[PDB]
Every structure is written in C-alpha cells, then in structure tokens.
Amino acid sequence: DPYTLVRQPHTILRVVSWLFSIVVFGSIVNEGYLNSASEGEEFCIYNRNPNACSYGVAVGVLAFLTCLLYLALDVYFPQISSVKDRKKAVLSDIGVSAFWAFLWFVGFCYLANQWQVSKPKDNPLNEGTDAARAAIAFSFFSIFTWSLTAALAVRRFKDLS
Numbered sequence: 001d002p003y004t005l006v007r008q009p010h011t012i013l014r015v016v017s018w019l020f021s022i023v024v025f026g027s028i029v030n031e032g033y034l035n036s037a038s039e040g041e042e043f044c045i046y047n048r049n050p051n052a053c054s055y056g057v058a059v060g061v062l063a064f065l066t067c068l069l070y071l072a073l074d075v076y077f078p079q080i081s082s083v084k085d086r087k088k089a090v091l092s093d094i095g096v097s098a099f100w101a102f103l104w105f106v107g108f109c110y111l112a113n114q115w116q117v118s119k120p121k122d123n124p125l126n127e128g129t130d131a132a133r134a135a136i137a138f139s140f141f142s143i144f145t146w147s148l149t150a151a152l153a154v155r156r157f158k159d160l161s
C-alpha cells in the first residue's frame with residue numbers, strides 16, 4: 001500500500017544512518033586519520049592506519065551526502081501522484097541502500113582488521129580509543145540499518161508494484 005509506505009521506517013533508517021555516517025566521519029577526523037591520509041609523506045600516505053580509516057571516510061561522507069539527498073526525496077514521496085513513479089523512486093534509492101550495506105561492510109572490515117594489525121588481536125575492538133571505537137561501532141550500526149533496507153528492496157517495491 002503506497003499510502004502506508006509514507007510512514008515507512010525506511011525514512012527513519014535514512015535519518016539514523018545519516019547521523020551515524022556523520023559520527024563515523026567526524027570520529028575519524030577527531031583521530032586525525034583523514035589528515036594523515038591526505039598527508040603526502042610516505043610514512044602517512046602508505047600507512048595502513050589512516051588508509052583503512054579513509055575507507056571509513058569514503059563511505060561516511062558519501063553516506064551523509066546520499067542520505068541527505070534521499071531524505072529530501074522522502075519529503076515529496078507522498079506528493080507523487082503516480083504509484084509507479086513512487087516505485088521508480090524506491091527502486092532507485094533502495095538498490096543503492098542495499099549497496100551501502102556492502103560498502104559499509106567493507107569499510108567496517110578495514111577498520112576492524114587494521115585495528116587487529118596495529119593492536120593485540122587477542123583483545124576486542126573496544127580496547128581502542130574513544131573516537132576510533134566510535135567509528136568502528138557506528139560503522140557496524142550503519143551496516144545493520146542498511147541491511148534492513150536491503151530487505152525493504154523487496155518489501156517496499158512489491159507494496160508499490
């Protein structure tokens with residue numbers, strides 16, 4: 001039912017992941033790994049630490065960009081007179097949302113794995129620093145919210161189809 005998807009938690013998930021993407025990006029910046037990644041020095045640009053974080057930055061800042069724009073679309077979702085055109089909008093966004101699950105999975109793994117390289121792998125990821133752990137945690141949290149949208153790729157689509 002098109003007229004129930006107007007209150008679909010999907011929109012909420014966009015807001016949640018929108019914020020989470022800010023937290024991850026910001027946390028990485030707070031650590032200073034973004035600056036290190038941009039640093040052309042061969043001991044920083046080839047350093048795996050900031051490079052792993054730069055993957056978090058990639059998906060972080062672009063998720064902010066994408067989700068922000070996606071939320072703007074939701075504003076006018078119920079303003080669409082054609083249910084078919086609504087399906088087009090959902091299909092277009094939700095396909096990327098499913099891809100975000102992949103993208104954040106990869107970025108997350110870079111953060112988690114690189115931590116196990118630089119720090120004792122016998123210890124859990126929660127033995128890292130405040131912001132570093134925030135980036136990892138909220139990256140994982142993002143994956144959850146994106147995996148929900150991956151399911152909605154069928155739910156919402158068929159409810160409009």
